[PDB]
Amino acid sequence: KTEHAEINIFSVASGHLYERMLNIMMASVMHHTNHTVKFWFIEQFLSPSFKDFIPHMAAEYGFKYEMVTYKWPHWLRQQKEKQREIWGYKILFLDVLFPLSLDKVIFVDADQIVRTDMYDLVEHPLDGAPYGFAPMCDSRVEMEGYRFWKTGYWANYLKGKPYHISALYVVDLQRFRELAAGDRLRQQYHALSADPNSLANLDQDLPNHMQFTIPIATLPQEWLWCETWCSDETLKDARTIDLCNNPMTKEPKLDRARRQVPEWTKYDEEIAELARRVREG
Ligand SMILES: Oc1ccc(CN2CCOCC2)c2cccnc12
Ligand SMILES: *[C@@H]1O[C@H](CO)[C@@H](O)[C@H](O)[C@H]1NC(C)=O
């Protein structure tokens, strides 16, 4: 709030491929809003070339940005696998990554394509919840055998509550801080992670596990569409598209992107055009 941007988004990206998609995600956000936007980056995972290109993206698309470098606390159980350490940075440090003056931030996955004004998510009512996540789609009936949350320990644990996808989430940082949600998420993660088989999908399982005591505002389903779980019929209503992994087809990432999203090549070529403009200038 105050002199802060109207829309504040953070993401995490590790690898040339995810950085290529991260620039596309940012271009898609700016093409769909006239509100002021600030992007926040988890600095230590990015390549030097990406960090050098960010000011060029910022000047071309008209956004502000900030690099955050937060050290994993020594007391807190560390993750030896890089993927799990990155997932830890998405969910365990929401209260310490951002300044106390920032009232709200949205996580948007690097492989997302935005087709809506993200200020609609800033304005979405959370009814006192410190954060809001979209549910996992049930609309693609053919994928029911892969919905692990509909049977076993998740079905018993959830008691009919939705199992939310972690690709996108809005965090009301004032309410998250008001509730000590960060200290409580770190403490439950620290205890649960003593079993190395627990929290298989760290970023996703932790908030879904804590949703009886750290409320989740279940976002409208249209906030997150992924082909793996969501029907073709619902794509026209999708505000954002996530290129989530399909355990049945195992189709490559770039193939999914080009095939599913018609504007993907347009953003990819636009960013490559900007890169060639900076290189020769
Ligand atoms: O509330 C929960 C927290 C963590 C996990 C991870 N489990 C992995 C298997 O061993 C037990 C821990 C859950 C899994 C299914 C359902 N609820 C869960
Ligand atoms: C942004 O402003 C322009 C010019 O006023 C308008 O044509 C466009 O529809 C606006 N876009 C959004 C997302 O408000």
mmCIF file of C-alpha atoms and ligand atoms in Angstrom:
data_model
loop_
_atom_site.group_PDB
_atom_site.id
_atom_site.type_symbol
_atom_site.label_atom_id
_atom_site.label_comp_id
_atom_site.label_asym_id
_atom_site.label_seq_id
_atom_site.Cartn_x
_atom_site.Cartn_y
_atom_site.Cartn_z
ATOM 1 C CA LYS A 1 0.000 0.000 0.000
ATOM 2 C CA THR A 2 0.872 3.801 -0.043
ATOM 3 C CA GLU A 3 3.624 4.423 -2.779
ATOM 4 C CA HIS A 4 3.560 0.662 -3.642
ATOM 5 C CA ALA A 5 2.415 -0.680 -7.117
ATOM 6 C CA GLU A 6 -1.272 -1.612 -7.503
ATOM 7 C CA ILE A 7 -0.391 -5.234 -8.547
ATOM 8 C CA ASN A 8 2.595 -6.998 -6.918
ATOM 9 C CA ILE A 9 3.571 -10.425 -8.244
ATOM 10 C CA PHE A 10 6.381 -12.768 -7.264
ATOM 11 C CA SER A 11 7.589 -15.898 -8.995
ATOM 12 C CA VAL A 12 10.402 -18.432 -8.785
ATOM 13 C CA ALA A 13 12.342 -19.695 -11.801
ATOM 14 C CA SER A 14 15.379 -21.937 -11.993
ATOM 15 C CA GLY A 15 16.793 -22.862 -15.398
ATOM 16 C CA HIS A 16 17.033 -21.235 -18.870
ATOM 17 C CA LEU A 17 13.702 -22.849 -19.901
ATOM 18 C CA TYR A 18 11.804 -21.530 -16.847
ATOM 19 C CA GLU A 19 13.405 -18.093 -17.252
ATOM 20 C CA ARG A 20 12.266 -18.013 -20.925
ATOM 21 C CA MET A 21 8.711 -18.766 -19.690
ATOM 22 C CA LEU A 22 9.017 -16.233 -16.818
ATOM 23 C CA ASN A 23 9.600 -13.359 -19.280
ATOM 24 C CA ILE A 24 6.517 -14.585 -21.262
ATOM 25 C CA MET A 25 4.425 -14.665 -18.032
ATOM 26 C CA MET A 26 5.431 -11.069 -17.233
ATOM 27 C CA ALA A 27 4.639 -9.871 -20.809
ATOM 28 C CA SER A 28 1.186 -11.563 -20.564
ATOM 29 C CA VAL A 29 0.410 -9.747 -17.260
ATOM 30 C CA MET A 30 1.342 -6.316 -18.681
ATOM 31 C CA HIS A 31 -0.645 -6.835 -21.932
ATOM 32 C CA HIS A 32 -3.790 -7.367 -19.773
ATOM 33 C CA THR A 33 -3.647 -4.478 -17.291
ATOM 34 C CA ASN A 34 -3.277 -0.702 -17.148
ATOM 35 C CA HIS A 35 -2.697 -0.799 -13.366
ATOM 36 C CA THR A 36 0.841 -0.314 -12.045
ATOM 37 C CA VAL A 37 2.761 -3.588 -11.596
ATOM 38 C CA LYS A 38 5.861 -4.554 -9.618
ATOM 39 C CA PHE A 39 7.493 -7.982 -10.063
ATOM 40 C CA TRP A 40 9.470 -9.496 -7.179
ATOM 41 C CA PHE A 41 12.150 -12.126 -7.821
ATOM 42 C CA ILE A 42 13.728 -14.775 -5.607
ATOM 43 C CA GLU A 43 17.217 -13.653 -6.628
ATOM 44 C CA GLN A 44 19.547 -16.590 -5.846
ATOM 45 C CA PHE A 45 17.958 -19.027 -8.343
ATOM 46 C CA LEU A 46 18.205 -16.752 -11.390
ATOM 47 C CA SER A 47 20.965 -16.718 -14.018
ATOM 48 C CA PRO A 48 23.198 -13.639 -14.433
ATOM 49 C CA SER A 49 21.822 -13.104 -17.967
ATOM 50 C CA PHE A 50 18.205 -13.032 -16.744
ATOM 51 C CA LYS A 51 19.020 -10.532 -13.995
ATOM 52 C CA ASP A 52 20.887 -8.376 -16.557
ATOM 53 C CA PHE A 53 17.882 -8.454 -18.949
ATOM 54 C CA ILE A 54 15.197 -7.565 -16.286
ATOM 55 C CA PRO A 55 15.822 -3.711 -16.586
ATOM 56 C CA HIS A 56 15.257 -3.978 -20.363
ATOM 57 C CA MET A 57 11.977 -5.885 -19.791
ATOM 58 C CA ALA A 58 10.996 -3.289 -17.142
ATOM 59 C CA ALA A 59 11.571 -0.316 -19.457
ATOM 60 C CA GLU A 60 9.852 -1.987 -22.470
ATOM 61 C CA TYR A 61 6.772 -3.238 -20.618
ATOM 62 C CA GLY A 62 6.601 -0.441 -18.020
ATOM 63 C CA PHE A 63 6.883 -2.298 -14.711
ATOM 64 C CA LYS A 64 8.924 -1.901 -11.532
ATOM 65 C CA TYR A 65 10.880 -4.802 -9.987
ATOM 66 C CA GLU A 66 12.844 -5.848 -6.915
ATOM 67 C CA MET A 67 15.279 -8.687 -6.216
ATOM 68 C CA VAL A 68 14.814 -10.401 -2.826
ATOM 69 C CA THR A 69 17.700 -12.461 -1.324
ATOM 70 C CA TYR A 70 16.518 -14.274 1.829
ATOM 71 C CA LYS A 71 18.719 -16.848 3.625
ATOM 72 C CA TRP A 72 17.180 -20.153 4.790
ATOM 73 C CA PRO A 73 17.174 -20.035 8.642
ATOM 74 C CA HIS A 74 19.698 -22.455 10.199
ATOM 75 C CA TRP A 75 17.136 -23.914 12.632
ATOM 76 C CA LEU A 76 14.658 -24.808 9.855
ATOM 77 C CA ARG A 77 14.954 -28.238 8.184
ATOM 78 C CA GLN A 78 16.719 -27.732 4.808
ATOM 79 C CA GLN A 79 15.816 -29.388 1.478
ATOM 80 C CA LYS A 80 18.755 -31.052 -0.277
ATOM 81 C CA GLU A 81 16.794 -31.338 -3.587
ATOM 82 C CA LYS A 82 16.822 -27.984 -5.494
ATOM 83 C CA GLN A 83 13.151 -28.393 -6.569
ATOM 84 C CA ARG A 84 12.051 -28.782 -2.945
ATOM 85 C CA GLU A 85 14.228 -25.842 -1.801
ATOM 86 C CA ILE A 86 12.525 -23.675 -4.470
ATOM 87 C CA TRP A 87 9.106 -24.915 -3.258
ATOM 88 C CA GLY A 88 10.172 -23.887 0.273
ATOM 89 C CA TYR A 89 10.847 -20.352 -0.996
ATOM 90 C CA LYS A 90 7.284 -20.179 -2.406
ATOM 91 C CA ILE A 91 5.483 -21.019 0.857
ATOM 92 C CA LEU A 92 7.682 -20.762 3.998
ATOM 93 C CA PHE A 93 8.856 -17.116 3.919
ATOM 94 C CA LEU A 94 5.818 -15.053 2.817
ATOM 95 C CA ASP A 95 6.107 -12.734 5.855
ATOM 96 C CA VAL A 96 9.898 -12.141 5.555
ATOM 97 C CA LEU A 97 10.510 -11.842 1.777
ATOM 98 C CA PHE A 98 8.539 -8.618 1.382
ATOM 99 C CA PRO A 99 8.662 -5.255 3.165
ATOM 100 C CA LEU A 100 6.197 -4.540 5.987
ATOM 101 C CA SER A 101 4.799 -1.701 3.793
ATOM 102 C CA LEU A 102 3.543 -4.218 1.132
ATOM 103 C CA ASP A 103 -0.067 -5.227 1.874
ATOM 104 C CA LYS A 104 -0.587 -7.878 -0.827
ATOM 105 C CA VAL A 105 1.389 -10.052 -3.190
ATOM 106 C CA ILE A 106 0.384 -12.701 -5.691
ATOM 107 C CA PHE A 107 2.460 -15.752 -6.624
ATOM 108 C CA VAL A 108 2.176 -16.501 -10.393
ATOM 109 C CA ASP A 109 4.042 -19.574 -11.714
ATOM 110 C CA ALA A 110 6.832 -18.911 -14.269
ATOM 111 C CA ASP A 111 5.106 -21.188 -16.808
ATOM 112 C CA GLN A 112 1.754 -19.326 -16.638
ATOM 113 C CA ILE A 113 0.008 -17.319 -19.330
ATOM 114 C CA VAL A 114 -2.205 -14.534 -17.973
ATOM 115 C CA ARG A 115 -5.414 -13.518 -19.874
ATOM 116 C CA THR A 116 -6.940 -11.160 -17.286
ATOM 117 C CA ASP A 117 -6.317 -7.952 -15.368
ATOM 118 C CA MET A 118 -4.442 -9.176 -12.265
ATOM 119 C CA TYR A 119 -5.931 -6.221 -10.278
ATOM 120 C CA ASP A 120 -9.199 -8.308 -10.292
ATOM 121 C CA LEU A 121 -7.316 -10.760 -8.009
ATOM 122 C CA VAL A 122 -6.029 -7.903 -5.813
ATOM 123 C CA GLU A 123 -9.688 -6.817 -5.384
ATOM 124 C CA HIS A 124 -11.087 -10.330 -4.830
ATOM 125 C CA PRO A 125 -12.663 -10.651 -1.357
ATOM 126 C CA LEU A 126 -10.834 -13.110 0.924
ATOM 127 C CA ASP A 127 -13.367 -13.016 3.815
ATOM 128 C CA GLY A 128 -10.561 -12.829 6.407
ATOM 129 C CA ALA A 129 -8.330 -15.528 4.836
ATOM 130 C CA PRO A 130 -4.622 -14.710 4.752
ATOM 131 C CA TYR A 131 -4.394 -16.293 1.274
ATOM 132 C CA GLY A 132 -6.470 -17.541 -1.661
ATOM 133 C CA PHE A 133 -5.774 -20.435 -4.061
ATOM 134 C CA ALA A 134 -7.777 -21.978 -6.931
ATOM 135 C CA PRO A 135 -9.018 -25.547 -6.486
ATOM 136 C CA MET A 136 -7.744 -28.441 -8.573
ATOM 137 C CA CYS A 137 -10.207 -28.945 -11.464
ATOM 138 C CA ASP A 138 -12.455 -32.011 -11.428
ATOM 139 C CA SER A 139 -13.857 -31.230 -14.954
ATOM 140 C CA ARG A 140 -11.523 -33.549 -16.965
ATOM 141 C CA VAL A 141 -13.260 -36.800 -15.983
ATOM 142 C CA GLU A 142 -10.699 -38.991 -17.854
ATOM 143 C CA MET A 143 -7.968 -37.951 -15.393
ATOM 144 C CA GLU A 144 -9.792 -39.129 -12.197
ATOM 145 C CA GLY A 145 -7.277 -41.944 -11.542
ATOM 146 C CA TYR A 146 -4.491 -39.339 -11.263
ATOM 147 C CA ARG A 147 -6.413 -37.135 -8.722
ATOM 148 C CA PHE A 148 -4.495 -38.466 -5.683
ATOM 149 C CA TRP A 149 -6.374 -36.014 -3.396
ATOM 150 C CA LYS A 150 -9.753 -37.708 -4.114
ATOM 151 C CA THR A 151 -8.781 -41.038 -2.380
ATOM 152 C CA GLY A 152 -6.601 -42.316 0.524
ATOM 153 C CA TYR A 153 -5.120 -40.122 3.239
ATOM 154 C CA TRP A 154 -6.026 -36.777 1.406
ATOM 155 C CA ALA A 155 -9.731 -37.690 0.961
ATOM 156 C CA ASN A 156 -9.987 -38.633 4.645
ATOM 157 C CA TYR A 157 -8.021 -35.586 5.836
ATOM 158 C CA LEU A 158 -9.814 -32.969 3.687
ATOM 159 C CA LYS A 159 -13.385 -33.877 4.790
ATOM 160 C CA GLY A 160 -14.790 -32.491 1.520
ATOM 161 C CA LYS A 161 -12.568 -29.378 1.488
ATOM 162 C CA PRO A 162 -10.970 -28.546 -1.863
ATOM 163 C CA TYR A 163 -7.407 -29.604 -2.636
ATOM 164 C CA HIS A 164 -5.922 -26.347 -4.023
ATOM 165 C CA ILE A 165 -3.314 -25.966 -6.789
ATOM 166 C CA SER A 166 -0.187 -23.931 -5.823
ATOM 167 C CA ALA A 167 0.465 -22.456 -9.300
ATOM 168 C CA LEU A 168 -1.242 -19.184 -8.370
ATOM 169 C CA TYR A 169 -2.147 -17.620 -5.021
ATOM 170 C CA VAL A 170 -2.985 -14.227 -3.579
ATOM 171 C CA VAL A 171 -1.531 -13.413 -0.140
ATOM 172 C CA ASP A 172 -3.036 -10.602 1.948
ATOM 173 C CA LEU A 173 0.314 -9.857 3.680
ATOM 174 C CA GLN A 174 -1.350 -7.608 6.301
ATOM 175 C CA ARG A 175 -3.661 -10.475 7.342
ATOM 176 C CA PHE A 176 -0.916 -13.133 6.947
ATOM 177 C CA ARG A 177 1.286 -11.028 9.374
ATOM 178 C CA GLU A 178 -1.735 -10.350 11.657
ATOM 179 C CA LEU A 179 -2.208 -14.139 11.951
ATOM 180 C CA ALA A 180 1.467 -15.309 12.455
ATOM 181 C CA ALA A 181 0.779 -17.633 9.470
ATOM 182 C CA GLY A 182 4.450 -17.578 8.461
ATOM 183 C CA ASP A 183 5.729 -18.671 11.898
ATOM 184 C CA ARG A 184 3.017 -21.367 12.049
ATOM 185 C CA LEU A 185 3.686 -22.670 8.502
ATOM 186 C CA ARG A 186 7.472 -22.873 9.257
ATOM 187 C CA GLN A 187 6.797 -24.716 12.553
ATOM 188 C CA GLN A 188 4.367 -27.302 11.021
ATOM 189 C CA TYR A 189 6.673 -27.789 8.004
ATOM 190 C CA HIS A 190 9.651 -28.316 10.381
ATOM 191 C CA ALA A 191 7.761 -30.994 12.359
ATOM 192 C CA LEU A 192 6.173 -32.721 9.321
ATOM 193 C CA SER A 193 9.413 -32.819 7.289
ATOM 194 C CA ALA A 194 11.091 -35.045 9.958
ATOM 195 C CA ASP A 195 9.423 -37.837 7.833
ATOM 196 C CA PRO A 196 11.164 -37.579 4.401
ATOM 197 C CA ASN A 197 8.068 -39.077 2.672
ATOM 198 C CA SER A 198 5.761 -36.247 3.979
ATOM 199 C CA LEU A 199 4.875 -33.128 1.935
ATOM 200 C CA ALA A 200 5.569 -34.783 -1.459
ATOM 201 C CA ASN A 201 4.336 -31.604 -3.248
ATOM 202 C CA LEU A 202 5.831 -29.241 -0.592
ATOM 203 C CA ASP A 203 4.418 -25.885 -1.861
ATOM 204 C CA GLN A 204 0.926 -27.363 -2.417
ATOM 205 C CA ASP A 205 0.560 -29.929 0.391
ATOM 206 C CA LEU A 206 1.535 -27.550 3.216
ATOM 207 C CA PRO A 207 -1.266 -24.909 2.711
ATOM 208 C CA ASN A 208 -3.806 -27.692 1.950
ATOM 209 C CA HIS A 209 -2.752 -29.455 5.201
ATOM 210 C CA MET A 210 -3.033 -26.209 7.211
ATOM 211 C CA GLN A 211 -6.370 -25.005 5.729
ATOM 212 C CA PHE A 212 -8.431 -25.843 8.866
ATOM 213 C CA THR A 213 -6.348 -23.396 11.008
ATOM 214 C CA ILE A 214 -4.815 -21.022 8.384
ATOM 215 C CA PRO A 215 -7.859 -20.438 6.172
ATOM 216 C CA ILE A 216 -7.726 -20.539 2.389
ATOM 217 C CA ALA A 217 -10.184 -18.421 0.384
ATOM 218 C CA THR A 218 -11.058 -20.857 -2.476
ATOM 219 C CA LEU A 219 -10.730 -18.736 -5.617
ATOM 220 C CA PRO A 220 -13.197 -19.048 -8.528
ATOM 221 C CA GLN A 221 -12.157 -22.059 -10.662
ATOM 222 C CA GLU A 222 -11.605 -19.781 -13.652
ATOM 223 C CA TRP A 223 -8.535 -18.267 -11.895
ATOM 224 C CA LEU A 224 -6.412 -21.316 -12.856
ATOM 225 C CA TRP A 225 -6.884 -23.629 -15.840
ATOM 226 C CA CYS A 226 -4.485 -26.504 -16.597
ATOM 227 C CA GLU A 227 -5.175 -28.974 -19.406
ATOM 228 C CA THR A 228 -4.162 -31.950 -17.267
ATOM 229 C CA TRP A 229 -7.124 -31.484 -14.890
ATOM 230 C CA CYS A 230 -9.474 -29.069 -16.637
ATOM 231 C CA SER A 231 -11.890 -29.666 -19.510
ATOM 232 C CA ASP A 232 -11.497 -28.037 -22.955
ATOM 233 C CA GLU A 233 -14.975 -26.465 -22.500
ATOM 234 C CA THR A 234 -13.806 -24.405 -19.508
ATOM 235 C CA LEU A 235 -10.731 -22.930 -21.290
ATOM 236 C CA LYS A 236 -12.760 -19.999 -22.761
ATOM 237 C CA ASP A 237 -13.560 -18.837 -19.200
ATOM 238 C CA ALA A 238 -9.922 -19.192 -17.933
ATOM 239 C CA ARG A 239 -8.345 -16.027 -16.524
ATOM 240 C CA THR A 240 -4.861 -17.703 -16.388
ATOM 241 C CA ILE A 241 -3.432 -20.864 -17.926
ATOM 242 C CA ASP A 242 -0.852 -23.010 -16.146
ATOM 243 C CA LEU A 243 1.304 -25.434 -18.169
ATOM 244 C CA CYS A 244 1.151 -28.070 -15.476
ATOM 245 C CA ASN A 245 2.676 -31.527 -15.960
ATOM 246 C CA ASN A 246 0.454 -34.229 -17.424
ATOM 247 C CA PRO A 247 1.261 -37.599 -15.773
ATOM 248 C CA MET A 248 -0.616 -39.472 -18.523
ATOM 249 C CA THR A 249 1.027 -38.022 -21.660
ATOM 250 C CA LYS A 250 4.325 -36.697 -20.273
ATOM 251 C CA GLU A 251 4.290 -34.189 -23.275
ATOM 252 C CA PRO A 252 7.277 -31.759 -23.291
ATOM 253 C CA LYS A 253 6.906 -28.249 -21.804
ATOM 254 C CA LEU A 254 7.485 -26.193 -25.004
ATOM 255 C CA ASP A 255 5.238 -28.553 -27.020
ATOM 256 C CA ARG A 256 2.367 -28.001 -24.449
ATOM 257 C CA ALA A 257 2.915 -24.223 -24.587
ATOM 258 C CA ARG A 258 2.830 -23.885 -28.410
ATOM 259 C CA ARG A 259 -0.095 -26.288 -28.809
ATOM 260 C CA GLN A 260 -2.392 -25.009 -26.039
ATOM 261 C CA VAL A 261 -1.913 -21.252 -26.079
ATOM 262 C CA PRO A 262 -2.164 -19.436 -29.461
ATOM 263 C CA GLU A 263 -0.583 -16.218 -28.109
ATOM 264 C CA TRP A 264 2.463 -18.043 -26.608
ATOM 265 C CA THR A 265 4.570 -17.790 -29.828
ATOM 266 C CA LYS A 266 3.602 -14.108 -30.097
ATOM 267 C CA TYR A 267 4.987 -13.336 -26.583
ATOM 268 C CA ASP A 268 8.056 -15.563 -27.163
ATOM 269 C CA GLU A 269 8.856 -13.803 -30.476
ATOM 270 C CA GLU A 270 8.179 -10.345 -28.929
ATOM 271 C CA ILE A 271 10.681 -10.944 -26.111
ATOM 272 C CA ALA A 272 13.245 -12.368 -28.591
ATOM 273 C CA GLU A 273 12.672 -9.222 -30.762
ATOM 274 C CA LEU A 274 13.343 -7.026 -27.670
ATOM 275 C CA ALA A 275 16.532 -9.066 -26.951
ATOM 276 C CA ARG A 276 17.820 -8.511 -30.545
ATOM 277 C CA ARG A 277 16.993 -4.767 -30.232
ATOM 278 C CA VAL A 278 19.053 -4.449 -27.001
ATOM 279 C CA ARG A 279 21.951 -6.566 -28.413
ATOM 280 C CA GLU A 280 22.429 -4.354 -31.500
ATOM 281 C CA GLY A 281 21.785 -1.101 -29.543
HETATM 282 O O1 LIG B 1 -2.166 -33.279 6.021
HETATM 283 C C1 LIG B 1 -1.172 -33.872 5.316
HETATM 284 C C2 LIG B 1 0.121 -33.419 5.545
HETATM 285 C C3 LIG B 1 1.198 -34.051 4.883
HETATM 286 C C4 LIG B 1 0.987 -35.108 4.017
HETATM 287 C C5 LIG B 1 2.148 -35.911 3.503
HETATM 288 N N1 LIG B 1 2.043 -37.349 3.986
HETATM 289 C C6 LIG B 1 2.883 -38.246 3.136
HETATM 290 C C7 LIG B 1 2.690 -39.698 3.605
HETATM 291 O O2 LIG B 1 3.027 -39.824 4.965
HETATM 292 C C8 LIG B 1 2.282 -38.990 5.820
HETATM 293 C C9 LIG B 1 2.444 -37.505 5.426
HETATM 294 C C10 LIG B 1 -0.326 -35.537 3.726
HETATM 295 C C11 LIG B 1 -0.639 -36.556 2.778
HETATM 296 C C12 LIG B 1 -1.926 -36.915 2.590
HETATM 297 C C13 LIG B 1 -2.944 -36.273 3.340
HETATM 298 N N2 LIG B 1 -2.727 -35.320 4.200
HETATM 299 C C14 LIG B 1 -1.411 -34.936 4.394
HETATM 300 C C1 LIG B 2 -5.969 0.147 -21.106
HETATM 301 O O1 LIG B 2 -6.221 1.463 -21.600
HETATM 302 C C2 LIG B 2 -6.487 1.510 -23.012
HETATM 303 C C3 LIG B 2 -6.609 2.974 -23.384
HETATM 304 O O2 LIG B 2 -7.389 3.716 -22.447
HETATM 305 C C4 LIG B 2 -7.739 0.694 -23.323
HETATM 306 O O3 LIG B 2 -7.965 0.682 -24.731
HETATM 307 C C5 LIG B 2 -7.568 -0.735 -22.821
HETATM 308 O O4 LIG B 2 -8.773 -1.470 -23.018
HETATM 309 C C6 LIG B 2 -7.196 -0.732 -21.338
HETATM 310 N N1 LIG B 2 -6.959 -2.086 -20.863
HETATM 311 C C7 LIG B 2 -7.372 -2.520 -19.667
HETATM 312 C C8 LIG B 2 -7.031 -3.940 -19.330
HETATM 313 O O5 LIG B 2 -7.987 -1.797 -18.888
#
